[PDB]
């Protein structure tokens, strides 16, 4: 804390003076002050405050030494991660007068025009990649066991008699699992039961709908500590991290073309018999809130573009703007990213490229009107940052006559806890919402969250990490690291998750046409924190794509994970992960 080193010196000065005014010869005069009693604003406020600045800044810098060369994760660039907004939950969307319709929803929907707070305002914020929807939603989600005792589920008989489903193309209609996954085996079973599906049999008696192309279900994106583990497993994110939720890979969930052997009036069956060989526990209940039709995520990303009041002098302007220096934006709101500018004098002066674009030696082989961004922090008390930034050759030419430089500025806002939002739809698309759309706000949003910069270890321990350096690893080296480094909402639940791990060791695979110095490792552990065979596969699944990545600087490296499920269990997954050549 800033108050931490403050509280050091507030102890320090008094423990100095208690040894002084007691017997030491400044009690020739100040003992006459402290016997009469001097907790003075004359002396004790100002002089303590005078020592407090030097006990803050120089003390805080020399305690940690945040050196300049720690700014080279910038050229590695996952590091936009250092300001993650509030995970606004997946939002919801009803029917709008179902009659021969097919919805088509572009992204960028601002929502929640209602939730102002006490010292808090209304937060507008965006969705990510909104989806054209299809008007139907079955309203009864029932576990039903067979005469052969197998718990099955319900049919698609919602809105088939109203609309032109010969005009509406049904391929890959997702559904993220609803609020029964708070029973935290529901998403575990119901996903891993769909690791073992069987076909379907539906009675509808409506000759309207004969499709194929079964979808991806989901509901992973509730979680956000498992999520950064799957983030840096695709170093390759370099542009897709820029709105940063990356719903492009969808956190792989498949069921193939699932064949309806559909049946006449009365006859049915929706089996998943291989996992459904072991049906639900008695403490696994059913609830009609596995209602999942239009679950679309939003994040807390607000937009604006402030006034171009630039430039005169040198690069030291850092964009404190009255849209943000607006008071309800002063107190809480901040800036996330700065994109796309440099349109003054001509149309092409200093575009926002060269801050990152140059990544090597031929700097004198570079045309003019180039750029760099530097950053800072901001005000004591918040996570504020400020951005001294400038050109590359025209400031070396020193003409401040460049004025009409544009601005593309995105940002978000802080708050105080104990919030509970007010769900509404803020804006409606044109000619598409035949009727409007309600917003249900499926769960509670999370907080802002920030990376641990609080340790020269836990800063430089990633600066090692992204290499082909794995040559010997054991279970102490993994549970300690850097799985903790992907955990910034650090819960006791999480603490029960990470601390399962016990034993890691290596051996060497030698199947061949030709030689094949290969290998493959083994770990899996206790059955409690990450104990459901759903999450025992799911939290596993985030791990494997990490483990494939760091594979080799020489082709003699080859990984396959077998994994001992419980102390009584067995599992292998992988297929041998042959990377193409990586020197």
């Amino acid at each position: 804390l800033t108050l931490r080193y403050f509280d050091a010196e507030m102890r320090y000065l008094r423990e100095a003076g208690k040894a002084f005014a007691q017997a030491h010869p400044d009690r020739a005069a100040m003992l006459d002050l402290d016997k009469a009693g001097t907790p003075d604003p004359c002396v004790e406020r100002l002089f303590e405050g005078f020592a407090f600045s030097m006990g803050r800044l120089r003390q805080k810098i020399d305690d940690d030494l945040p050196e300049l060369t720690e700014s080279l994760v910038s050229m590695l660039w996952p590091h936009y991660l250092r300001t993650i907004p509030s995970l606004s939950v997946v939002a919801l969307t009803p029917r709008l007068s179902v009659m021969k319709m097919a919805e088509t929803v572009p992204a960028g929907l601002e929502v929640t025009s209602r939730p102002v707070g006490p010292g808090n305002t209304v937060c507008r914020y965006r969705t990510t990649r909104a989806i054209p929807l299809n008007p139907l939603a079955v309203e009864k989600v029932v576990m039903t066991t067979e005469p052969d005792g197998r718990s099955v589920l319900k049919i698609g008989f919602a809105c088939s008699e109203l609309a032109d489903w010969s005009q509406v193309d049904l391929h890959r209609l997702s559904l993220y699992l609803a609020a029964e996954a708070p029973v935290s085996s529901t998403l575990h079973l119901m996903m891993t039961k769909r690791l073992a599906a069987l076909y379907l049999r539906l009675p509808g008696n409506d000759e309207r709908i004969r499709i194929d192309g079964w979808f991806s279900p989901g509901g992973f994106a509730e979680e956000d500590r498992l999520w950064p583990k799957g983030d840096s497993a695709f170093s390759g994110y370099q542009l897709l991290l820029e709105y940063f939720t990356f719903r492009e890979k969808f956190m792989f969930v498949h069921l193939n073309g699932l064949e309806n052997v559909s049946l006449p009036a009365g006859i049915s069956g929706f089996d998943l018999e291989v996992v459904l060989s072991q049906p639900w526990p008695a403490d696994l209940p059913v609830t009609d809130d596995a209602l999942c039709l239009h679950c679309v995520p939003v994040i807390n990303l607000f937009t604006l573009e402030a006034d171009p009041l630039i430039i005169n002098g040198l690069e030291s302007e850092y964009l404190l703007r009255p849209k943000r220096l607006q008071d309800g934006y002063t107190e809480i709101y901040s800036v996330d990213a700065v994109t796309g500018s440099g349109r003054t004098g001509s149309a092409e002066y200093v575009p926002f490229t060269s801050f990152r674009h140059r990544g090597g030696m031929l700097r004198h082989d570079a045309p003019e009107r180039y750029y760099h961004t530097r950053v800072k922090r901001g005000v004591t008390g918040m996570y504020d940052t400020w951005l001294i930034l400038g050109g590359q050759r025209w400031e070396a030419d020193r003409m401040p006559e460049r004025e009409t430089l544009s601005l593309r500025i995105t940002g978000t806002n802080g708050q105080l806890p104990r919030r509970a939002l007010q769900s509404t739809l803020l804006d409606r698309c044109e000619q598409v919402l035949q009727a409007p759309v309600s917003v249900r706000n499926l769960c509670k949003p999370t907080l802002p969250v920030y990376p641990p910069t609080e340790d020269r270890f836990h800063w430089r321990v990633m600066s090692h990490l992204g290499t082909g350096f794995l040559n010997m690893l054991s279970s102490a080296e993994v549970l300690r690291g850097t799985l903790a480094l992907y955990n910034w909402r650090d819960d006791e639940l999480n603490h029960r998750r990470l601390d399962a791990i016990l034993a890691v060791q290596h051996h060497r695979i030698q199947r061949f046409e030709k030689g094949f110095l290969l290998r493959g490792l083994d770990v899996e552990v206790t059955l409690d924190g990450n104990g459901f065979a759903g999450e025992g596969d799911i939290h596993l699944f985030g791990e494997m794509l990490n483990r494939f990545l760091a594979l080799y600087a020489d082709m003699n490296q080859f990984n396959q994970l077998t994994l001992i499920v419980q102390p009584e269990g067995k599992c292998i997954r992988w297929k041998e992960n042959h990377n193409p050549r990586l020197p």
Partner: protein, 350 residues
Amino acid sequence: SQSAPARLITRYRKQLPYINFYRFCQLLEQSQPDQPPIGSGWQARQEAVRFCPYPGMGFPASEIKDAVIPEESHLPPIVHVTFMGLYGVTSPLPAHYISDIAQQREGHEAAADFLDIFSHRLITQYYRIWRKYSYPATFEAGGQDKTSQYLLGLARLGIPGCAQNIATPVSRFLALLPLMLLPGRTAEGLTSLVTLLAPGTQARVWHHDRRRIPLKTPLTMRVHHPVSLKSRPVMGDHATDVNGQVLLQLSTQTGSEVQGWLPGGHLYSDLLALLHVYLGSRLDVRLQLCVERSLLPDARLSCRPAAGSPQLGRTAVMRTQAKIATSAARVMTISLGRYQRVQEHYQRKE
């Protein structure tokens, strides 16, 4: 301590007019280093430290020529260099504190002790910057793999947290630091790995060897009818795998080093410095020496039987001069196995 003036200023009080303070305050911490009064914890507890009589001098750096250390009031620092030492000192005293001292009189001589409370704690950390915090060239900090300098400027090779299974602990970066940095490399560095660890010892590396068995569970020298395929495998029952079991020989002349390269001496040093430091699971390293006639014991009891396999060295009973030979083998630096078994379950349908 009592001992620190008793070592420094009572004995070696001839260089104090010409002493470097950066030198001086270093030799202070070398004087009591065991449980030192560690100056980093100055931010609450200068009480019960008893530091040097530096403050009140108003000096710039290494200007300390004045040296007065009492013994009686449980604190050494009582120094007020009067009318000199105006180190940032600008203006007269304000009104209420002159009235507290009455009237900028000889009572200021008992007030400068309070007044120099800040300049006590400042020149602490001013020194701390210069010697330990951000200067020290990894040469003043000079630790035993403890200094934050070492942990910063060593972890770029990529060993944080990995203190597991390192018997001779991580200090021999000092040659290996540039050579452990070029990736996927190399052959030359192993010669440096010898040259550091023992002088006078010369070596050459051969790029490939006739490695043999690995015995394969299908024998397949009977043909198939149903599934008979040809393309690559031309062999009998044992195969040779050339592919990365490189080979080293050594050259010494002194029997100290020769018995320094017994199993027992410095042989375990290279065995550590490979298998967790520089190679890991890339290769396997086969070892050999070639030296003179014999330096050999007898066949007696419990435990020194094996120079690896070979044992000779009493057949020479007769000859007055000698010849060179090759010595022995040492095994590959290996890490392998099979763990046991076969599996039950599967990955994913996509």
